[PDB]
Design a protein around this ligand. Structure first.
Ligand code: O1J
Ligand code: O1J
Lengths: 269, 268
């Protein structure tokens, strides 16, 4: 991959692998999500961020601050097939003191058409106490030089689905998958559960018949709390709606503490 | 990737990704195993095999026969770091009417040194009845033209660890991880559990302290039966010794064996 001419965005091409695809021979939403995080990491490396484990500026490292994902929004129009080349362009934007945003645009390398788009909201947090905090001027000045100053949105639209408030699913759930546990392959280089694993867990409670007859077009996921390596998760889903919509909830198996809430929109194959 | 000059082997380069590494910032053995299967798939595509879902010759497709993994053996000397380029060379060989073998050699693209090697034994089977069959002459003649005829071994050595008989672990196990279930990400394009998931399950019963202080040098795994999408697995491990372990995966309820294996770890 490489930074674009102005050094304000980053592009990378990927060839879809045999184990990265589902029954339709096209990349799963989890493969897409992994590719988005990889291109984000390569963008941080290309602009001087160290390979320490967490992308931090000088002030962030000094104050033990890290960026953490609070919400992820992905919309796919066409999933790349096994062997196809997908091109991903990514960039970051300061959201004042609230936090920061990373956006992505997915394209078919052969036709040049937009096949998907994504956006993620990051909030600043102390690594040790897990307490959120506003972005300081010292931190903002340090990373602002790597961002476009004028607004550049992947989801420009006025009443778009990336800014909708997600309600908490009420018991009883229509569908559920219980006893979900992370294995070592679900952990990242920092021994934390990878954000993409939560997407997989959310999708585990969607009945197989919906998966076999529909394509996932939109997924919105809020991250409230982390699943530790020794935690067990219950995945809950209720249909809210040729389109099917679902409301999702991940919670700890025992006490029922919420870890994630989300929504999915599927269209008929 | 591309076939080599003689068209009898295939090479491909991979850049190690951020999510593909463990806490040492080097590729996990599961990432390596995924890369080996990917380069195997690209080799089958480059020699005329269709993208149907199972690599089959004309007579295999007619008789509903598929190759299935019976044994996988991987030895790693150095794991590639995040951002490093690993080069993998792969080839197949006829093992008479017993089956087929796929071998791999892993190299550091920058230094050119061998950083790992792997071998897998495949057996032919009817995809519907699940019954193993010997390799017929019609099938042999069809794929022999894509293999070196003289022996070419990734593990040539006599008395090497890739041909050792693995015993069945006896209860009680020293360590265990119970209630393991596959999710949709563990399935392949044919809706079967990916072979690499079994490697992950085997490793789940290795205590974390061994993982934190040792590096996995060798893993030998036998595949006896598949775990279905609605099955639950128990992973069992006992130290037999460098640290050596004997492994067993079995169905959570009836205790039917799905895999047995061994691992050898080196002190960091
Ligand atoms: O996406 C990540 O993993 C980290 O990106 C940090 C960054 C990169 C470029 C510009 C601002 C911030
Ligand atoms: O590794 C696979 O997935 C299938 O490879 C089949 C093959 C490829 C080349 C030569 C003989 C057989």
């Amino acid at each position: 991959g490489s930074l674009t001419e102005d050094g304000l965005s980053y592009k990378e091409k990927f060839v879809v692998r045999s184990y990265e695809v589902g029954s339709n021979k096209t990349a799963t939403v989890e493969t897409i999500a992994n590719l988005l995080q990889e291109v984000g990491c390569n963008h941080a490396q290309s602009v001087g961020f160290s390979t320490d484990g967490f992308a931090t500026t000088t002030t962030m490292r000094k104050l033990h601050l890290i960026w953490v994902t609070a919400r992820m929004h992905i919309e796919i129009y066409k999933y790349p097939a096994w062997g196809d080349v997908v091109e991903i362009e990514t960039w970051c934007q300061s959201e004042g003191r609230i936090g920061t945003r990373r956006d992505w645009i997915l394209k078919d390398s052969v036709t040049g058409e937009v096949t998907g788009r994504a956006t993620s909201k990051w909030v600043m947090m102390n690594q040790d106490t897990r307490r959120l905090q506003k972005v300081s001027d010292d931190v903002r000045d340090e990373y602002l030089v790597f961002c476009p100053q004028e607004p550049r949105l992947a989801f420009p639209e006025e009443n778009n689905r990336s800014l909708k408030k997600i309600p908490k699913l009420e018991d009883p759930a229509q569908y559920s998958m219980i006893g979900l546990k992370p294995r070592r392959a679900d952990l990242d280089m920092n021994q934390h559960v990878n954000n993409v694993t939560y997407i997989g867990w959310v999708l585990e409670s969607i009945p197989q018949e919906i998966v076999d007859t529909h394509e996932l077009q939109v997924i919105t996921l809020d991250y409230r709390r982390e699943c530790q390596q020794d935690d067990v998760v219950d995945s809950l889903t209720t249909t809210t709606s040729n389109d099917s919509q679902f409301l999702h909830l991940l919670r700890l198996s025992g006490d029922g503490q919420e870890i994630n809430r989300g929504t999915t929109l599927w269209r008929k194959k």
